[PDB]
A paper describes a structure:
The 26S proteasome unfolds and degrades hundreds of proteins to maintain proteostasis, regulate cellular processes and generate peptides with second messenger functions. The redox-active thioredoxin (TRX)-like protein TXNL1 is expressed in many cell types and was proposed as a nearly stoichiometric component of the human 26S proteasome. It uses its C-terminal PITH (proteasome-interacting TRX) domain for binding, while potentially reducing disulfide bonds with its N-terminal TRX domain but how it binds and is regulated remained unclear.
In PSRpt1, five subunits, Rpt1, Rpt2, Rpt6, Rpt3 and Rpt4, engage the substate and Rpt5 is the seam subunit, albeit at the top of the spiral staircase, ATP bound and ready to engage. This state, thus, immediately precedes PSRpt5. There are four subunits, Rpt5, Rpt1, Rpt2 and Rpt6, bound to ATP, while Rpt3 and Rpt4 are ADP bound.
Author numbering:
A (entry chain K): 8 to 127, 134 to 241
B (entry chain L): 4 to 241
C (entry chain I): 4 to 251
D (entry chain C): 306 to 406
E (entry chain F): 294 to 296, 300 to 439
F (entry chain J): 2 to 240
G (entry chain A): 290 to 307, 314 to 433
H (entry chain G): 6 to 244
Amino acid sequence: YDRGVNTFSPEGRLFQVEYAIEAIKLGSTAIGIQTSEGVCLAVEKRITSPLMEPSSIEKIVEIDAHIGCAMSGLIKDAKTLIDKARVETQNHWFTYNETMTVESVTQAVSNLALQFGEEDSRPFGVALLFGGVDEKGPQLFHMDPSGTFVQCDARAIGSASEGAQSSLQEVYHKSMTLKEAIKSSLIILKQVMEEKLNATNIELATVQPGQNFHMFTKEELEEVIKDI
Amino acid sequence: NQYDNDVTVWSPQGRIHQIEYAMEAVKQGSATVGLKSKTHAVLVALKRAQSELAAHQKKILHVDNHIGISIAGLTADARLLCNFMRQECLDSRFVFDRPLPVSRLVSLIGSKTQIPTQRYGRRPYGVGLLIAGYDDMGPHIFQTCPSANYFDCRAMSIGARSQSARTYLERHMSEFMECNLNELVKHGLRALRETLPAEQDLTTKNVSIGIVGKDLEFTIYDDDDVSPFLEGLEERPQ
Amino acid sequence: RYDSRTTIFSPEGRLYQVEYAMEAIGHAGTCLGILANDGVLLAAERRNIHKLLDEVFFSEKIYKLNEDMACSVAGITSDANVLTNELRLIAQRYLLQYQEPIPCEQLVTALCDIKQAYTQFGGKRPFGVSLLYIGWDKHYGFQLYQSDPSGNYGGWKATCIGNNSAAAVSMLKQDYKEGEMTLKSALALAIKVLNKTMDVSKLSAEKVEIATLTRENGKTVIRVLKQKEVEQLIKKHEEEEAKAEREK
Amino acid sequence: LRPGRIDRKIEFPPPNEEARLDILKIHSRKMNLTRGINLRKIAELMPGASGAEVKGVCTEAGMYALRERRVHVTQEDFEMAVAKVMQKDSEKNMSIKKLWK
Amino acid sequence: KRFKAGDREVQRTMLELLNQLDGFQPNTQVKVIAATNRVDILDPALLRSGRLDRKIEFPMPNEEARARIMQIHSRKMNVSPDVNYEELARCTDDFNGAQCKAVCVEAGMIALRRGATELTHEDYMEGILEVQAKKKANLQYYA
Amino acid sequence: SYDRAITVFSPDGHLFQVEYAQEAVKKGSTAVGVRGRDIVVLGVEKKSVAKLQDERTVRKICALDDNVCMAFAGLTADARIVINRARVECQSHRLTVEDPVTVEYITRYIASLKQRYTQSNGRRPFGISALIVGFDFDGTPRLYQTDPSGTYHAWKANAIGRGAKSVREFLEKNYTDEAIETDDLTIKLVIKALLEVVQSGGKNIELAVMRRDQSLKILNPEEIEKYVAEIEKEKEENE
Amino acid sequence: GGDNEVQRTMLELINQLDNIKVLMATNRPDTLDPALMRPGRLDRKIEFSLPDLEGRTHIFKIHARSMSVERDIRFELLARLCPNSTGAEIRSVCTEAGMFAIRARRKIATEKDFLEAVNKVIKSYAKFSATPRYMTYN
Amino acid sequence: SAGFDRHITIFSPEGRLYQVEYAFKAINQGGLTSVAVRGKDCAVIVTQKKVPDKLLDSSTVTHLFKITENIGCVMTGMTADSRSQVQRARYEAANWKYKYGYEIPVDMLCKRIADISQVYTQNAEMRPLGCCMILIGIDEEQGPQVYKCDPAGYYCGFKATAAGVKQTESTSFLEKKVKKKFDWTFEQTVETAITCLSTVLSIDFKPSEIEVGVVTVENPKFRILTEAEIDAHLVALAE
Amino acid sequence: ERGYSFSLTTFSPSGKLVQIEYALAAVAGGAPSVGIKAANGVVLATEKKQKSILYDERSVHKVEPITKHIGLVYSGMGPDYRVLVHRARKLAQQYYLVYQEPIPTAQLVQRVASVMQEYTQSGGVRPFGVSLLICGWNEGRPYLFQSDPSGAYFAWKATAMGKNYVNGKTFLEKRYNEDLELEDAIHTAILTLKESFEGQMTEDNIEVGICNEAGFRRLTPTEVKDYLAAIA
Amino acid sequence: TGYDLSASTFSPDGRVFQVEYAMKAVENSSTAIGIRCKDGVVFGVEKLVLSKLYEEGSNKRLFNVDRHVGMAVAGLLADARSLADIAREEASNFRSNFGYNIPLKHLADRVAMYVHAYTLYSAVRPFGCSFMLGSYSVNDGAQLYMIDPSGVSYGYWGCAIGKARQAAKTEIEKLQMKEMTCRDIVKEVAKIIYIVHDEVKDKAFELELSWVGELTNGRHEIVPKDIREEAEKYAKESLK
């Protein structure tokens, strides 16, 4: 019952999308918190050798100037889905002359995701976090290989998803500021990280309504972690 | 046994095991209660949240100004069927310039979902749809089970632990016709609460209501918008 | 086991179906190309030498591709036929498009590109036929090219395929001659190796086929030797062999 | 087959001409060979004859004299006995035989 | 079935049994019955005229039979008046009668765990899920 | 039983067919590539001459474009096809966009070409992982590594083939800024990197170097021999 | 043969089975007789599945209550590095952490040893999942 | 002797297509048999009309079908596939007449039909139609001809033939008849067919139990004799 | 080899395409047919022995023409032979339409074998389980070719497939001399089927096609009866 | 076993097992009957309501193929709806191509060919429903046709489909449908369908009837309510 995306288990489950979801646990922890001030996005680098360029590891990519992205799982599937997101939001801007809402970009990415056995392949073994600011305000959206897209005030994907999520429920609350959200996310990441936290072990990215520029953290990661 | 791997094969007892398994996908989703009066068609859905601090999933979808659904099954199949409905409704409004009657939409859904259950290359649509609509022939409530079989339901509830709602609806079946908006919505809320476990109770975040009426289009009430129907609900006996 | 399809990768990373096609060339016929300057040859063998076989082609194992290209064949008959048809078609396409003969390697590259495609796309059995190529061009002159059912090729100075391929290549290496490889010496070496790699002795002329390519007045005449010249060649080898017994 | 259990792994290849002639001479020592029977020629008529097949050839050469009530075996008695013991089964089908060029 | 091994003692028992079934003729008040879950391994000599004969056929209960069977084994338990035994039968397939009683037993046990007196339909559903050792997890990809 | 298909996920979310594709490169010859300040040198080991075949048709380092070159591993049959496809693609990109391809763009194209082969049933993945290194970036040298799965990564230096673990581990300890400060030192870095050959013969090492706005220059077996001798003389300091 | 002897012993046991409570444990429940597994002899069937993360931390804490560990150990972190791990392999990881802390003469088993113990108990025998083929997950 | 069988495209080790073999054993599933015999100037076909109820519309139970005004056929096999073969043959005959300008000879008719059935045997797309076609018709310059052509695609001319459960017995009885040569007139041909079916079935043949089709050179038109005519023929057979 | 004999696109560990061999075994279990090449022409003979007297012996012909100068014979699946003869006729007509000269035997056999190879390269299509003997009179020298389901076309001087084919070849190489003529080629061909045909040689049981200077033509039963009375 | 999984495989006996399985799936459906009157045809179908929550007149099993053609499916209802759809498409195509209402014989033959076409490929399955077609025309009389899942289609004077096939055949054969005008054969159909469906099993049930003939002027529309009430009352009077 688990050899295809076309077979249903006797208890009713598609025992192929579940396996794709299990592939997320084989990624790296990614933490995102949505606040009124903005949305943060922290990710473990998990570099394998010092020789590889840190910029080569694309864990936080940019769908557009107004929404960030976080990945966990397959690099190839995620890059395929990301090329969909950038192209889709650019097409939406071209046709409607406006910035796409993060919910709509997540909808398009999911619409691509709902095609593993819904055409006429395999589910994309990657979970996607979409953080950005829109008309309704700052918003964080998370989607899974099944294409189920939902918004989360603060969500953690990849490895340590259960532990990071559980430790995030206790610390997070609605009236949170961006600096405190960054500090809390870094604290959770350091707690759930296998290696000691430093500048090169993580990348950070924040999205604010008024500073839709600077969708990264270059060399000032050292300042933030040193105040932990 | 061995005849439960493909829809194309027939079991010795004259059953198709894949659809019987597809039937089970509906019960995986949360319970959703749909009931119609002589003047309104309202379906109430139990929304679930994957985590404490994650927003509850949308259970009631918008198909047209006079047809709306609640989904109980697979999310991907639900989205695909909703997109198919929206495209069909737009085409009908474009070509006949008339709000397409809900029965024809349900028949088209049956025709489309009957395709996977006869040709290999696609799995059955593992989603259950409570189709609520208002055409010129009065309010309606349909349920499209994944077996491509649809029934004209006066009131129905599918999903996880949805049976306790069905026995409540069948018990208050007679009085559903001569009900106004608020009383019918309260009956639906009572059924949905019957689906809930003893510890859980309907709060403003886990319940969603969508109503289509004589002069009212299909409108989604969530968060604060469900509260006007949530207030006045009688507390569950305990 | 992981040899059900040609597109299945073994846990060790080995394409089992491909190697099954590779090792199956041991059942193919013996065709070899000897080292030679100002010329080059292939020496094929006729397994089916039954008397009731009427001979009409005289080149059942030797095929001419271009006006300056010739190739042997070793594999399944139908695969060899379709492969040589594609060979001639590609060579003529290049001749039409560039108004210049195919420069040897690009034709072999074309076949290997076609052949590997069967080893990557599903539903197609890999071409189980390996084939030598000879030819001349204005780039590198006489060349000898080794096709391999995996789509892998390689330049060579002396090689053989088919039955007793290892013995033939080892014997060719035993007397391997670089530079001093005149056409007469190449023919003598071909007959000398065919005497041993073929189980049947005395090397009957009708059971041995030699095809030679030489540059004559800028024409690249491709020759298949008739029964008389093969007879005198095996006679020369026999007379040479008689002298070798004077050691005792 | 790992060493420490099997130190030497001795191969027994089919005998060569100078070896098959030896087999022909040890299995015909008790045989009343005539004059002019070149045992090397019979050995030359058996390419790759296993080694037991040489003894079979000797036995059948003697048998060809038993059915004639004699005690001596001639060269023709061996040459006509080589084709009997050293018989071969062909494919007997050109369609299968030309599967491979 | 038949097969000097150590089974030559039960063989005499079986043959003596066969002798007594064939010894007594019908029309007397010595009607015999025998039960077994595997007739595949039964010696057909036992299933011959004059011996047992008239093989009664016991099938796996169908949906209505499953609902009825689940109804009988809950009469002694304070089951709630609103339990759709028919729906229970729909959700119970490939289930023998022993499991159709174990579902009621497990439903009562789960009701005791929940600290309730009457057994709701959800208790019966959890009994169905637990009689086959399955654990019900709310999968996130359905919604 | 989760490894006889490419589009079947293992219970733990593994594409075992994809993983088995990375076994082909581990069986191929060792290829090393390090990026220098002005000379990006890539080298290959284990030439494994058959002593009867001309080495021209054996070439493993090929230039995809005028300013980019790539050395592969794994099986050559798929390597030739990816060679031709990359060459056609870079020429086509030069046609549609006047600016010639950059190293990252050609690496992305190769990765996407491999991924579209690993994405569907009935199509076996390219069983190679190529080292994309070139100076087409117009000022900043870059070197990349593709994977048979379809993932491309940028390294300051890499090592692929049979011996990737050992060469990579030894390369970290001696890859620093002072080593790459000189072009000759940069090529000597390749020299000692491939010096850990299977047999360490020293005559089976083929190194190619490309410089800023220059042409590809495969080292002749007299400059390569001279550099090997120079490295040995530098290594003679241990005595 | 003698196989039917233990067969008849099992049949007699089933006869005895069908205030007495009976316990049975097995790691291969598919080899048992269906008659013995029917809910007239075994009315309940409890499945001991692989523990979740929260249970894996609990097992780690139980097996490390007597160990001489440093009071900073992130057992929650260690649980996530043992996916699909039985309760016995966690005990082996705890034992091997002290093994590593004994190999080098340290009387306190720090967190670094526990990661090393995991890399050799779990990762060294879970699967291959090597670095050259693990550059696809990130 | 199950063999490989399960796929029609797979040859057995001995070289017999087992799946195509089972089509013939599917032919006689209907429990009916049809007998064709060629006279000196006519061809007649007699089939079994076993209506196992009083509610069936006896008009539509016919196993005889009219493909063209000059050629008729009788069906032995599964009813659905027999009707499908009838529909295909009607289209084939119409296409022949429209393409070449004259009516199709009976031989070419299920030469084409057996050609269609043969492609179904090779390509693993269509399950072979489990039914035989027995065709009669007056073609000029050769008189009446009868053709029986099977799912396997083998067609031949028969002086008389029969397919069904009682096929071997019927063909044996014809073997007995066509040998003692006599004047095969129309009444003699009908008598021979009636005797065939009666002897193989040992049935008195109530007039509602059979359907006989006649094609004669005098009137080259497919005709199904009504109940009274077959009653008269049965009476003439009686005396 | 044991489990890989099913698929025709899967090599065995010894690299044997077992399905083609099974198709050839199906060829070897067919009706024996013989063709021999004389210095005057080519003669092909086959036994069309029906299972009963009930059959019309003149209905279906085994020895069949393609062009005016080429004839075919087979030993195997007759339904498969019909599609083969149809495609061979189409290919010959296509060559005639383009080159305006009649198809040479070598080329026609090459393209027929290529048609045979088309059905032995993908799953779902079965090899043409018939072997074909093809004659030809062209450029003043007779031809006799055999094409098998494997697509390997030979240049048989004289051969015989079908049942007891080994004994048929054993008869040849004994009474077959290269310098014979057509008239005794008929007698040799009739003799060859005599060692395998179980029964009396009646004029509607052995069909012979001479492929002479004038062209290939299937012998009418009267001439076959004349030759058969001559030999007997 | 082994010869049963695919509909393109023939058993060693020589039968398509998938087809027989589809047929034995139809017997797991509520009984539907049809008796053809002297000047028309009448259908009586039993609709077992599965729950009180279904609205009256839901998932109906009487379909209108065309203006004069009628449909009385029995089996799994999804394939029944699809078969109704393809039959309506065929009828519309025939009307648009030939200019007149499609004859019942031709429509039944074409629908049988469509049904039979799905019992030949391994990629599809035989339909799980068996249905009766009926129509009346002054130029063709009245016809009734069964098209079973295998694809066979021959006329029935009176037929039944569902669980109680033989049980309804026995009570149909004792009627003279040749003569009695089906003004009262609707009444007799209600009677007969009330004999079948023992009340102990299947619980509640609901009965739908439709007719074709001179009475309805060629059409097939459902019988008016007033006649249906009296027909049901007359059916209930046969309790003894």
